[PDB]
Coordinates of C-alpha atoms and ligand atoms in Angstrom, one line a residue:
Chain A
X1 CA -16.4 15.9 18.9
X2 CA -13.1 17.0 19.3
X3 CA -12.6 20.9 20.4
X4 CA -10.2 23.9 21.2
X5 CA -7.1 21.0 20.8
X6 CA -4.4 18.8 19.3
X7 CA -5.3 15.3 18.3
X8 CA -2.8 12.8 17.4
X9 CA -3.8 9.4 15.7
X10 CA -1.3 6.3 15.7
X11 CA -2.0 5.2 12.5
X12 CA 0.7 2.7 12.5
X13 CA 3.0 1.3 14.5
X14 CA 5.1 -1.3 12.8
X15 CA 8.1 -2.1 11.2
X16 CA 8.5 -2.1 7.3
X17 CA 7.0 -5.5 6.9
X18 CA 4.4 -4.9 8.9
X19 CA 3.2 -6.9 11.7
X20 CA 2.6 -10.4 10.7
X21 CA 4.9 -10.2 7.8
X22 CA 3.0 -10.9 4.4
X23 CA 4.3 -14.7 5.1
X24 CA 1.9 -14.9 8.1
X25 CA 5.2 -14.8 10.4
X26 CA 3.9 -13.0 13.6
X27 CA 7.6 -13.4 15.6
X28 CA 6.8 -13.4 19.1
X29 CA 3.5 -11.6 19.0
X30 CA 0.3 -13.0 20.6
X31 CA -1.5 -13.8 17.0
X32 CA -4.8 -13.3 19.0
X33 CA -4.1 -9.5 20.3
X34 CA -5.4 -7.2 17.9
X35 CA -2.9 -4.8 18.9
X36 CA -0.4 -6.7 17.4
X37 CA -1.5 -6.4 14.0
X38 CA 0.7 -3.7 12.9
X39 CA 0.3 -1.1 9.9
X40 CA 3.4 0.8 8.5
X41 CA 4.6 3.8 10.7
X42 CA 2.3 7.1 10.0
X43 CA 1.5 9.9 12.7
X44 CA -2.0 11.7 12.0
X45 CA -1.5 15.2 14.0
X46 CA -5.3 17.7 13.9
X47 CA -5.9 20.7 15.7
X48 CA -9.6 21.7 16.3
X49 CA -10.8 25.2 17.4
X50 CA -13.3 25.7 19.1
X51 CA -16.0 25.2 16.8
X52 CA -14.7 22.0 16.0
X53 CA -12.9 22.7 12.3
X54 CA -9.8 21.0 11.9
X55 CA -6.4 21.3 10.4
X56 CA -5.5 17.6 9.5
X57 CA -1.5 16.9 8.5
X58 CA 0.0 13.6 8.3
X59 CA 3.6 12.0 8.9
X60 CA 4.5 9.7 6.2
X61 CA 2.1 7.9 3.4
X62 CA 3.1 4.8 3.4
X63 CA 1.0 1.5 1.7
X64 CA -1.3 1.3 4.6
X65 CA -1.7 5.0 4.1
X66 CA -5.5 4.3 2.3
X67 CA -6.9 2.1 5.3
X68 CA -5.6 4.1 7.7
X69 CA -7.9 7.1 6.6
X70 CA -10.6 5.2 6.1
X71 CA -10.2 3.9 9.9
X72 CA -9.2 7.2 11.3
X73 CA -12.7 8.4 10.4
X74 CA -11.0 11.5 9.4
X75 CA -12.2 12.6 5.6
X76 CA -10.2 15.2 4.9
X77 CA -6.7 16.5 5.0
X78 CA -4.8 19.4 4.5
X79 CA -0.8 18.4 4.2
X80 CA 1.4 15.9 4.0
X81 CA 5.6 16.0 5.5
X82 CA 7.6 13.1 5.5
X83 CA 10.6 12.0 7.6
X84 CA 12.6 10.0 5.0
X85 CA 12.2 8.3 1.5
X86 CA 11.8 4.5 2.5
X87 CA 9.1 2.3 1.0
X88 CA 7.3 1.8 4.2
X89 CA 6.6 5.8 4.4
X90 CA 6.4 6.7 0.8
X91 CA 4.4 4.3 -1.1
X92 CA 1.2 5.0 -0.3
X93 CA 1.8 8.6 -2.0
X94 CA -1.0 8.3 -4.4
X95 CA -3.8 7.8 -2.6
X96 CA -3.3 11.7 -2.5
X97 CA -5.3 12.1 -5.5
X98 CA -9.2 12.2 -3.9
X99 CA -7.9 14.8 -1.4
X100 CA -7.0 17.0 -4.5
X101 CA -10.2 17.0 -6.0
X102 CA -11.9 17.2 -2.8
X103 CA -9.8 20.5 -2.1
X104 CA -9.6 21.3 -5.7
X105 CA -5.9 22.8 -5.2
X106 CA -3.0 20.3 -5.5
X107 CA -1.6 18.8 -2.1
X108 CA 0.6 20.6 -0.1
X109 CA 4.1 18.4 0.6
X110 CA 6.5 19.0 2.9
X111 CA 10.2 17.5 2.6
X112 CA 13.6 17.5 2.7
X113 CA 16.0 17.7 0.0
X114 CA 16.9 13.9 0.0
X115 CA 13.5 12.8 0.2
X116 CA 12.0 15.1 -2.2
X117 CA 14.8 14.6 -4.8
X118 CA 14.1 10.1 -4.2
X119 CA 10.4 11.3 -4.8
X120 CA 10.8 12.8 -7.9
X121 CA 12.9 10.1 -9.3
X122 CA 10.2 7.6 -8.3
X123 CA 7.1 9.2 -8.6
X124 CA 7.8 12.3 -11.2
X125 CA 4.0 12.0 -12.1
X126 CA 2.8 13.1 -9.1
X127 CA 4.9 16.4 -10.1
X128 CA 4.5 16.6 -13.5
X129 CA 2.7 15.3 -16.6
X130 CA 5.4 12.6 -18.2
X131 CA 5.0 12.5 -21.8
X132 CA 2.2 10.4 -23.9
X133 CA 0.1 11.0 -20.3
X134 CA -2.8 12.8 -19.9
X135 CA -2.8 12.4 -15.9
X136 CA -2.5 16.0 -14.2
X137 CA 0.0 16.3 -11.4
X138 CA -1.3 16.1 -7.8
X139 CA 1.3 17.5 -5.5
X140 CA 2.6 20.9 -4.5
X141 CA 6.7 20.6 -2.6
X142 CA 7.6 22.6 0.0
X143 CA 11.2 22.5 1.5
X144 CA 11.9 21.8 5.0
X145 CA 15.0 21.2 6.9
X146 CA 16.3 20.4 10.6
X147 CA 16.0 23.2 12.9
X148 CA 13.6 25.3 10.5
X149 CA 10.3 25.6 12.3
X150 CA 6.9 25.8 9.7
X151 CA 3.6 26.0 9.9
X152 CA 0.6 24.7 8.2
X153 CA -2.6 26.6 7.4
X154 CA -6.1 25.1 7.9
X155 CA -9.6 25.5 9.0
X156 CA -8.8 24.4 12.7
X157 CA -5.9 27.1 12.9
X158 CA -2.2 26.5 12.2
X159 CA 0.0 23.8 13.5
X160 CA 3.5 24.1 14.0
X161 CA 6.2 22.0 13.1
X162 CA 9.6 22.2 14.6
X163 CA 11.8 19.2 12.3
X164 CA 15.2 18.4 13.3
X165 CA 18.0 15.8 12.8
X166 CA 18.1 11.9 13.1
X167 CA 20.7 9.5 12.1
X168 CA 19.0 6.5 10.4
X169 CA 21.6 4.1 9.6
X170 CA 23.5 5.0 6.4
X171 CA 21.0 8.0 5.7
X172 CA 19.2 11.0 7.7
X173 CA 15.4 10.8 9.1
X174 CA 13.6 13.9 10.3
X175 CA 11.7 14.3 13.5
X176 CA 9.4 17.1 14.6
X177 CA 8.2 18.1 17.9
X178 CA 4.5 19.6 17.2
X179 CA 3.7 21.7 20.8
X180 CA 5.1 19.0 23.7
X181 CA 4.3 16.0 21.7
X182 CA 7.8 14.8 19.5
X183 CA 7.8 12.0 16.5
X184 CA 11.0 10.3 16.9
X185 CA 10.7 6.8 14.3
X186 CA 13.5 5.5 11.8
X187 CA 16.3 6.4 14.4
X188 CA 19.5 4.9 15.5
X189 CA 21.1 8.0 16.8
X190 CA 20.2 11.5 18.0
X191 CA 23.1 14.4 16.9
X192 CA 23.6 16.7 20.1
X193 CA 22.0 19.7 18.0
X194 CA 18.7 17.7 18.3
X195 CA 18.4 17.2 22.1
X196 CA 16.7 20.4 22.5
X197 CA 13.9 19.4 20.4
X198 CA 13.4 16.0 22.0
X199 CA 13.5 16.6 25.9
X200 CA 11.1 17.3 28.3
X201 CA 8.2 16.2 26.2
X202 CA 4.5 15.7 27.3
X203 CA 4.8 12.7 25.0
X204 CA 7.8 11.2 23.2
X205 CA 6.6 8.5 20.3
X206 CA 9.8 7.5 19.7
X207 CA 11.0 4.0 17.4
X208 CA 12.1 0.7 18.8
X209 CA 12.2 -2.0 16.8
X210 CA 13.3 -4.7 18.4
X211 CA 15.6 -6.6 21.3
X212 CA 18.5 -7.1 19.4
X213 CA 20.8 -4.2 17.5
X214 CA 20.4 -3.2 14.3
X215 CA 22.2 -0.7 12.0
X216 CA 19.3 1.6 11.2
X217 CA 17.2 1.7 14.3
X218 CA 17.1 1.7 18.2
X219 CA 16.5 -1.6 20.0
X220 CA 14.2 -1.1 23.0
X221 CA 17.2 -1.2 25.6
X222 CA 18.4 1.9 23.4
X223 CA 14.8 3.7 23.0
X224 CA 14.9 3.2 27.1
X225 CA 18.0 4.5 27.7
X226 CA 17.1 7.4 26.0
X227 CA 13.7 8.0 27.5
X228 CA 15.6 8.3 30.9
X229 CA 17.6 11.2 29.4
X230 CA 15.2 12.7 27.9
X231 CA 12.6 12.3 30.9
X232 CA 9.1 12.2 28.7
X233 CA 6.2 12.6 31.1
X234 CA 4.7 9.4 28.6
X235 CA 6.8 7.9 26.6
X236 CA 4.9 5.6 23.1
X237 CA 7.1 3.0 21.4
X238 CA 6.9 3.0 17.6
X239 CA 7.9 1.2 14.5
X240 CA 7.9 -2.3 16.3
X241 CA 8.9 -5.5 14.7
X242 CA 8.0 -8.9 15.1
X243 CA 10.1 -9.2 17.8
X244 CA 8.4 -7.6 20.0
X245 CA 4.9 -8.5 21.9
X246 CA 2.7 -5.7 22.8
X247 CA 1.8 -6.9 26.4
X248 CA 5.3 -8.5 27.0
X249 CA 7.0 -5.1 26.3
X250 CA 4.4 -3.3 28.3
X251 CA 5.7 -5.5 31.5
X252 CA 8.8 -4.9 30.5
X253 CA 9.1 -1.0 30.5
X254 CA 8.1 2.0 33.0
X255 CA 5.1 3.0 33.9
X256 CA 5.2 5.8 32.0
X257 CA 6.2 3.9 28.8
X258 CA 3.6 1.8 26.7
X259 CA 4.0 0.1 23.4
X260 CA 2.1 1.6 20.7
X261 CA -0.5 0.4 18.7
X262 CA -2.9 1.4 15.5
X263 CA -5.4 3.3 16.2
X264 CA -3.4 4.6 19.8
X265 CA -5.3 8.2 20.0
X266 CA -5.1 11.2 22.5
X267 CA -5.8 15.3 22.6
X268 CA -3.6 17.6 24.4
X269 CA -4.1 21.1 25.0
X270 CA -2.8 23.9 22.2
Chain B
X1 CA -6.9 -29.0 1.2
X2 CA -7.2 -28.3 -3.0
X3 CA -5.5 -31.2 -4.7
X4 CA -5.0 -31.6 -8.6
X5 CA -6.2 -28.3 -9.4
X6 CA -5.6 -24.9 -10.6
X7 CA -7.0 -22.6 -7.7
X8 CA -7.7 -18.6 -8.5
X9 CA -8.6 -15.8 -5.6
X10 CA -9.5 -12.7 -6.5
X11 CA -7.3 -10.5 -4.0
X12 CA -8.8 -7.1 -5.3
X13 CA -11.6 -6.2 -7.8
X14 CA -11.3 -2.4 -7.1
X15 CA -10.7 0.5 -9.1
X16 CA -7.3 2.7 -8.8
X17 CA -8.7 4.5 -5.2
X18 CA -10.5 1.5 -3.7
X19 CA -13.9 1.4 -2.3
X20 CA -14.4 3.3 0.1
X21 CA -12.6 5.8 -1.5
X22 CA -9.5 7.2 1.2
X23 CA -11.8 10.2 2.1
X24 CA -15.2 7.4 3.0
X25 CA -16.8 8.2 -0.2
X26 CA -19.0 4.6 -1.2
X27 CA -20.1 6.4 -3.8
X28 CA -23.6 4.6 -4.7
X29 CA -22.3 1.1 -2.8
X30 CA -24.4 -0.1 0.2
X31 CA -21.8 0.6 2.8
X32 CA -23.5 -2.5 5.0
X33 CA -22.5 -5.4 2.3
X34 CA -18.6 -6.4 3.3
X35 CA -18.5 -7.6 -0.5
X36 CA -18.5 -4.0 -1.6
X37 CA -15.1 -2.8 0.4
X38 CA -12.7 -3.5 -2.0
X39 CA -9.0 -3.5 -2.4
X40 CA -7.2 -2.8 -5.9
X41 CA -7.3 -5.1 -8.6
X42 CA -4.9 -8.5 -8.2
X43 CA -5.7 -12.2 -8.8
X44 CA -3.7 -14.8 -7.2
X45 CA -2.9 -17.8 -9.2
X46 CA -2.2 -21.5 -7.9
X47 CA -1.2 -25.3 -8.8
X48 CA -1.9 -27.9 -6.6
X49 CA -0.2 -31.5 -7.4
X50 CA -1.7 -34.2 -6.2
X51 CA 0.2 -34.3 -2.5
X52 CA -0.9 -30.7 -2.4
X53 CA 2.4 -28.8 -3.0
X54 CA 1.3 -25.6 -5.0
X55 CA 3.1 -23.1 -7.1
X56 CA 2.0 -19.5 -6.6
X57 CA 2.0 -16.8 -8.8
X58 CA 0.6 -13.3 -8.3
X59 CA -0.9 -11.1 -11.2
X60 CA 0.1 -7.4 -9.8
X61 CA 1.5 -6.4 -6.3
X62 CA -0.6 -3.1 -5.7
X63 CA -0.4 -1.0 -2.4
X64 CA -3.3 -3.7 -1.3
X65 CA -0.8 -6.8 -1.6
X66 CA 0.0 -7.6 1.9
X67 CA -2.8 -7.9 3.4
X68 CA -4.1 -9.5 0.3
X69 CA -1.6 -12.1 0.9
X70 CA -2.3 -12.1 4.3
X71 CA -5.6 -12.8 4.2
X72 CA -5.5 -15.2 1.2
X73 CA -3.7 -17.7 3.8
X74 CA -1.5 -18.9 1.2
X75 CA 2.3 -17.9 2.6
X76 CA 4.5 -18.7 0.0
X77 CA 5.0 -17.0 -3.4
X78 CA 7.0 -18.3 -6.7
X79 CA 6.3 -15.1 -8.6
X80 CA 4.9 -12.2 -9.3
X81 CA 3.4 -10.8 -13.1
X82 CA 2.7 -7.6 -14.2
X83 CA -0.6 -5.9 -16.3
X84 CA 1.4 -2.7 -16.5
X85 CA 2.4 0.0 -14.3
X86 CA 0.4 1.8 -12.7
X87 CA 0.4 3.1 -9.4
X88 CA -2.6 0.4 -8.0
X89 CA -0.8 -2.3 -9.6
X90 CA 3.0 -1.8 -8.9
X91 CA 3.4 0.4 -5.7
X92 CA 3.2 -2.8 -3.2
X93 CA 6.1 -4.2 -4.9
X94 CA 8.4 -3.6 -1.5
X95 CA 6.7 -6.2 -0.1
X96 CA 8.0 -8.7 -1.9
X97 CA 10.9 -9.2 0.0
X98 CA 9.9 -11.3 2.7
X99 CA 9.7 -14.4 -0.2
X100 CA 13.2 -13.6 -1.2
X101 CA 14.7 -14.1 2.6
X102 CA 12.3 -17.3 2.6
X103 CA 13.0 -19.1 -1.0
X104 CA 16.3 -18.3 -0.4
X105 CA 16.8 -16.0 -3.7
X106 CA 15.8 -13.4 -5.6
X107 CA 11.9 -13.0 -6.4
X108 CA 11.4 -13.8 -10.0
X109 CA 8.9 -10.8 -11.9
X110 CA 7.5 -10.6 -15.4
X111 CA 6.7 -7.5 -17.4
X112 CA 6.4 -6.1 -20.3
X113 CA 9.0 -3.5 -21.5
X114 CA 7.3 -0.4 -20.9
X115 CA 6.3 -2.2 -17.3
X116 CA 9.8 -3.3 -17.0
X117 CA 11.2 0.3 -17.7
X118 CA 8.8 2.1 -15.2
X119 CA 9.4 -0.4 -12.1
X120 CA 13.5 0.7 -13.0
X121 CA 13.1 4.2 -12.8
X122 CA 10.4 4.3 -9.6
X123 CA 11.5 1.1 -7.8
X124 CA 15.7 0.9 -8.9
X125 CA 16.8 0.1 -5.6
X126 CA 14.6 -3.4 -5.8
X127 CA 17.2 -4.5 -8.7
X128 CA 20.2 -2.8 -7.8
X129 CA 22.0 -1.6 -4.7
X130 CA 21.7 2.4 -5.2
X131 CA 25.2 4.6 -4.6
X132 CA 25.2 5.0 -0.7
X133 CA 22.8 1.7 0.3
X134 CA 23.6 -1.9 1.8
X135 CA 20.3 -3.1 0.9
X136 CA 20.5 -6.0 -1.4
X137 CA 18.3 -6.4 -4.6
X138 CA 15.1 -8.9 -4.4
X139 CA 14.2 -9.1 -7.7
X140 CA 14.6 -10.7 -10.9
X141 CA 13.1 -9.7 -14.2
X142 CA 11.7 -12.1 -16.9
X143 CA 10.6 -10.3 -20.4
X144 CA 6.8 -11.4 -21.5
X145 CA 5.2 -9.9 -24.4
X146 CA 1.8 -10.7 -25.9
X147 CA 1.7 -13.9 -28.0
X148 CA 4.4 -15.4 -26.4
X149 CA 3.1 -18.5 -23.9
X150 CA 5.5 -18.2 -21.0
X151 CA 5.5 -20.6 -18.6
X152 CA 6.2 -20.6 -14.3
X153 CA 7.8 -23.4 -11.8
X154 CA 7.1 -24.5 -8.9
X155 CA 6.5 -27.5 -6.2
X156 CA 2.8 -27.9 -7.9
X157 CA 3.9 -27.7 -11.3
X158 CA 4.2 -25.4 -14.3
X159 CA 1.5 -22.8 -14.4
X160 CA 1.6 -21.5 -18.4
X161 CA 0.4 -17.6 -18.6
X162 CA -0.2 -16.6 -22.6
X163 CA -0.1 -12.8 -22.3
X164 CA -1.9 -11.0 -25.0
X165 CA -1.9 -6.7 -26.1
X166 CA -5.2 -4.9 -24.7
X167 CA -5.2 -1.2 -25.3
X168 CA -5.9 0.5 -21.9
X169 CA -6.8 4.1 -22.9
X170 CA -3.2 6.6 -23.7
X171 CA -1.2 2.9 -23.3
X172 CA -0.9 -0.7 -23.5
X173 CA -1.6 -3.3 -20.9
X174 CA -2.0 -6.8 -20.7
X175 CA -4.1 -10.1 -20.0
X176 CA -3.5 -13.5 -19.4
X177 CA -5.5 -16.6 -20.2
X178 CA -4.6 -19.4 -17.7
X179 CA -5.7 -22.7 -19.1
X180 CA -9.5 -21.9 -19.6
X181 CA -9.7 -19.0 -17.0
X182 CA -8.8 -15.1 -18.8
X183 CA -8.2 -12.3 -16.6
X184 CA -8.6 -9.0 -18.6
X185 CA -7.9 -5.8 -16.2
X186 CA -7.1 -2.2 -17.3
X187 CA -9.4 -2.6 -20.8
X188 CA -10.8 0.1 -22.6
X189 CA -10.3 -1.9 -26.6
X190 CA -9.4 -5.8 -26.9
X191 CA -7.0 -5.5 -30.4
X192 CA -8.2 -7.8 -32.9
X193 CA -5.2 -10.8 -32.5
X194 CA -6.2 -10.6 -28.8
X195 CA -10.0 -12.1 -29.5
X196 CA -8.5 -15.8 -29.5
X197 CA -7.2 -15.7 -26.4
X198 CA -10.4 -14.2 -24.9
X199 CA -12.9 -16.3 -26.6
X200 CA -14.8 -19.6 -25.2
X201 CA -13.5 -18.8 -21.6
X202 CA -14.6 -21.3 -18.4
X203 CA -14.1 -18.0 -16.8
X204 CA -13.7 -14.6 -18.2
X205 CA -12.4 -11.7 -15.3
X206 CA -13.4 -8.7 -17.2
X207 CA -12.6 -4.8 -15.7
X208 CA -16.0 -2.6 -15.5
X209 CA -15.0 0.3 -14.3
X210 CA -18.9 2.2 -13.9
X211 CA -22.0 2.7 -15.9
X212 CA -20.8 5.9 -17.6
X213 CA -17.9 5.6 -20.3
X214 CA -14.2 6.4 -19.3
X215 CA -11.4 6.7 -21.3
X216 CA -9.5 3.6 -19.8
X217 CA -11.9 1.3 -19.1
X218 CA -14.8 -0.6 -20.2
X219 CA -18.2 0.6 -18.8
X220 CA -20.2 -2.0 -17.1
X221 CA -22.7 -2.2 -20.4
X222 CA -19.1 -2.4 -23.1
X223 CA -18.1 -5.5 -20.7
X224 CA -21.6 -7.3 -21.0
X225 CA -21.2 -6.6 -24.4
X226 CA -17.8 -8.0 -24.9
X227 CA -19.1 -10.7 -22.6
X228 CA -22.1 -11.2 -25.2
X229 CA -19.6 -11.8 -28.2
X230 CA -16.9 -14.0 -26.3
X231 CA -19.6 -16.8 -24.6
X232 CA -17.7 -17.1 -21.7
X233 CA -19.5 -20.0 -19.6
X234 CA -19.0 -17.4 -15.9
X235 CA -18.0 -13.8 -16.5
X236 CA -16.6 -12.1 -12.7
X237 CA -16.6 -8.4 -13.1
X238 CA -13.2 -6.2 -11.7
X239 CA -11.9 -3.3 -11.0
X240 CA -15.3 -1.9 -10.2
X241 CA -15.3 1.7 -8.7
X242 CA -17.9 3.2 -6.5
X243 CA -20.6 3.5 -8.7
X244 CA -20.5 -0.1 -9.2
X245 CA -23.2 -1.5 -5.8
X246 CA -22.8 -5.5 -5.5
X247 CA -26.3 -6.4 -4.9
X248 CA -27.5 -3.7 -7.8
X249 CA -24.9 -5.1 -10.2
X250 CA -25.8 -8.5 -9.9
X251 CA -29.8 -7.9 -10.5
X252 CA -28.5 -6.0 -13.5
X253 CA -26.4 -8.6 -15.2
X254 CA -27.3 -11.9 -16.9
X255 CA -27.3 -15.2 -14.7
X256 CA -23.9 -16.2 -15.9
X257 CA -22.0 -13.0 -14.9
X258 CA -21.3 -11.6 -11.6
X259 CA -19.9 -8.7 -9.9
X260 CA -16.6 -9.8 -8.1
X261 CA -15.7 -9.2 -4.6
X262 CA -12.2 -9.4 -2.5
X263 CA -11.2 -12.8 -1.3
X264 CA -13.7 -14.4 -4.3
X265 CA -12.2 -18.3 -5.1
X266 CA -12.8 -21.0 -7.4
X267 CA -10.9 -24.3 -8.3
X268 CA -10.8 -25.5 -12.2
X269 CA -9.8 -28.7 -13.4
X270 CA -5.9 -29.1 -14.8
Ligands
5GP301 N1 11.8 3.7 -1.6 C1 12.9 3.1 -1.2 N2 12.8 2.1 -0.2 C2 13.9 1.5 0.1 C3 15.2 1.8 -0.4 N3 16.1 1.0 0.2 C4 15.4 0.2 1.0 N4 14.1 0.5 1.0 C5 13.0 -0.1 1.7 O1 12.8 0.8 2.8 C6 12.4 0.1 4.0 C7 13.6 0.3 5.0 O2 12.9 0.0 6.3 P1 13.3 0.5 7.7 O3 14.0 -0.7 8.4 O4 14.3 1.7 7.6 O5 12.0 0.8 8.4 C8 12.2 -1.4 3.5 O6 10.9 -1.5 3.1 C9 13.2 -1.4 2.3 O7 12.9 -2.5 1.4 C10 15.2 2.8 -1.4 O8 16.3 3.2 -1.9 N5 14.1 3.5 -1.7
5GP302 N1 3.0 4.5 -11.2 C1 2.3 5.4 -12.0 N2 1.0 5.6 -11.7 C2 0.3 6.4 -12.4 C3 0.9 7.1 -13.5 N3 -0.1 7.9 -14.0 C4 -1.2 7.7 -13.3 N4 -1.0 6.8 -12.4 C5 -1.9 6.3 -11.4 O1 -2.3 5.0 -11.9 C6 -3.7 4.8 -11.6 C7 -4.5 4.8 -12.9 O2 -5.7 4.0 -12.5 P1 -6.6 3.2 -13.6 O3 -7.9 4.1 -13.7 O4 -5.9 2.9 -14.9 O5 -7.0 2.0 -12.8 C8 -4.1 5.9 -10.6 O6 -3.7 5.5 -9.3 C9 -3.1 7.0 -11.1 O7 -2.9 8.0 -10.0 C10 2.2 6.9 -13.8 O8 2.8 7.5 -14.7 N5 2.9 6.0 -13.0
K303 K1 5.1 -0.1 30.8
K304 K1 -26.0 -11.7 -12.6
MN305 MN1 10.6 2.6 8.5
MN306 MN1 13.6 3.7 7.2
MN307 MN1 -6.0 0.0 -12.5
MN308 MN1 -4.4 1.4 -15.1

């Protein structure tokens, strides 16, 4: 058992298709590496004392949300934040529900503005009782915004969230750096009032989707380029398309750089 | 391969958290028996010609629905129909938008108008391009309404759905008879001008929630009795929660009726 430490689970790793595409359309990926298969990007972050309770917060709830519980072996949870309000990290948001009647207090939420006002318009039960329902509501929103450290409250102590600033395409993302390890995915740009949060990390997870440009999110020459600036001591490539084949991008990045993959797991010192 | 057929696979027969539940809870299913991990309720419905070309339709697009279609190995999809909307029947509906890139244009969907008017206000941006987005719509909406035959095309030929009103506890959702096979999810009442299309069924796919009664759903003993009155010639149990044990059910139930399980498939006569 885990003890007197952070844990972080990659609980997905792919693009917002996922990885084959519902069509069966694996890209370039080796169909017969399991690390290939690719759930919908999600972060689990824990911190165990020394007894071994845990404080257990996840990034993002998106449809694979359910499954990747199950497979974490990890049966309880004490918050939710999100980084932005796209399907692949929202729509997975009810499977909530058995945590709130496990912990018998409604689930603690943590978002921006944008994302909290796009929840509300698209899953206002969740907040409150619509009429001719009989359905109680299951969340609890708390505000966060770039630059605003918080901290969540559990039975393995508190874990500390540091959020800041992306540029996704047409909209903002948040990341968070949570001690040395930083959660970088749905990024095409870093503002310079971010770069503080995302250097010199222990471990940078940080989104590439794919070879050629695209509007909303780094290719892997761009998510390279950027690991040399920010000089990670590891560096784990997220939210990765079709495109791109988990040992073929291994060859084709530093040592110190992997692809990621569900399931990808690691403890670091609080 | 199927030829002159219609082919159904039962992509889910779980109830609205799955089984496991998302915190490992089997509840009283034998964790052992694969047939009792089960994703949320969906039926896949096909025509085969006799050259083999098939039309595909799906009966919900839960947060299950890709890896349903997935594992189904069936890769192309004419269009999707709707029960009504609730969260483990609608919230996969992003993944629809790989068929739209393939076919070429927008995914035809069919619903109700209380369906229709939920998917609007939760999933807008999948019918019109929101104030500040470049994504494109994917979908296209048909009305059905119970009583009213309405009929799909394809490269295997038509597949005619006749929709009928079941009351599903505070609201209204639907079934479908499909030639001589009914699929009846989401039942707590079948109204009395529903009992034709229900009756003398080759196969009747009929919701048991659990053992004890629920305000939505049938109980396992209200389905065998339904099943008792209609003289379906096969009954397949859904949307079974985690009360509901495979093995245990079957002992329980007459010779003719069967607990479902994901990835279940049969092939009926045109
Ligand atoms: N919930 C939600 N999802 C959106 C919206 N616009 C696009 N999407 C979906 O969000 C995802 C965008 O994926 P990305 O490439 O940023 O990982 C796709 O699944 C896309 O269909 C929106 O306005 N709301
Ligand atoms: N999309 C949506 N889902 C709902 C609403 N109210 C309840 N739900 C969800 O719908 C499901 C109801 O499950 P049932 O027992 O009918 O299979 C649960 O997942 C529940 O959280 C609603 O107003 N809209
Ligand atoms: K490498
Ligand atoms: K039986
Ligand atoms: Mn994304
Ligand atoms: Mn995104
Ligand atoms: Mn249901
Ligand atoms: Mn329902």
């Amino acid at each position: 058992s885990p003890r007197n430490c952070l844990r972080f689970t990659l609980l997905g790793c792919g693009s917002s298709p996922g990885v084959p595409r519902i069509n069966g359309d694996w890209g370039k990926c080796d169909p017969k590496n399991p690390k290939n298969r690719r759930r919908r990007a999600s972060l689990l972050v824990e911190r165990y004392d020394a007894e071994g309770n845990n404080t257990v917060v996840v990034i993002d709830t998106g449809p694979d949300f359910r499954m990747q519980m199950i497979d974490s072996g990890v049966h309880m949870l004490d918050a939710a934040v999100y980084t932005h309000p796209h399907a692949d990290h929202i729509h997975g948001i009810d499977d909530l529900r058995t945590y709130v009647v496990d912990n018998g207090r409604l689930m603690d939420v943590y978002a921006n503005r944008l994302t909290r006002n796009r929840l509300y318009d698209t899953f206002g039960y969740c907040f409150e009782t619509p009429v001719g329902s009989s359905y109680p509501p299951i969340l609890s929103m708390h505000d966060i915004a770039p630059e605003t450290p918080f901290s969540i409250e559990g039975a393995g102590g508190a874990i500390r969230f540091e959020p800041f600033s992306q540029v996704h395409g047409d909209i903002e993302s948040l990341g968070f750096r949570i001690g040395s390890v930083v959660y970088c995915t749905d990024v095409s740009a870093f503002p310079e009032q971010s770069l503080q949060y995302i250097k010199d990390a222990d471990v940078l997870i940080i989104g590439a989707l794919q070879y050629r440009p695209h509007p909303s999110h780094f290719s892997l020459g761009e998510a390279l380029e950027w690991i040399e600036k920010l000089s990670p001591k590891r560096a784990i490539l997220t939210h990765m398309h079709v495109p791109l084949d988990y040992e073929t991008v291994m060859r084709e990045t530093p040592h110190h750089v992997e692809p990621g993959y569900d399931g990808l797991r690691f403890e670091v010192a609080v």
